Amino acid sequence: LETIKKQQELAKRQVQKDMGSQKEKWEKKKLEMIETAEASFHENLAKNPV
Amino acid sequence: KFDDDFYEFRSKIKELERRLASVITQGFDDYDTIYGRFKLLDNFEGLLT
């Protein structure tokens, strides 16, 4: 019962201890910068042939 | 072949989950104290299927 009560305490932390405010938005901003980089690379690949 | 092996395993689990549900109902019909019964739940709190 004590080991399971300890797991519940550790479980509350694991959920809301490693939890950080604004996570999905930061991932979307990282994706946007990669999309712009790929867009610049395809333009450079268009300029090579042309 | 895996899809067939899943259906076999899923059936065994559904038989197992019915035996667990029967064991929990026996164990609850025993303690006969709001405290003893709430303690039982806490043991299976992570073991809800």
Burial A14-27 (b: 16+ CB within 10 A, else e): eeeeeeeeeeeeee
What is the DSSP annotation of B18-46?
A: HHHHHHHHHHHHHH-SHHHHHHHHHHTSS
Method: cryo-EM
Tokens standing for residue A34: 């990669």
Tokens standing for residue A18: 């490693």
Q: Calculate the CA dihedral of residues A30, A33, A39, A41 and round it to 10 degrees.
A: -100
Tokens standing for residue B6: 């899943």
B41, closest residue in chain A (CA to CA): A1
Contact at 8 Å (CB) between A4 and B45? yes
| Helix, strand, or coil (residue A23) | coil
The set of residues, in sequence order, having a beta carbon less than 8 Å from that of B24 and lying 6+ positions away, is B40, B44
A7, closest residue in chain B (CA to CA): B46
Q: Which of B32, B39, B36 has the alpha carbon at shortest distance from A4?
A: B39
Contact at 8 Å (CB) between B1 and B14? no
A1/B43 Cβ within 8 A: yes
Tell me the backbone φ, ψ of residue A21, rounded to 5 degrees.
-70, 130
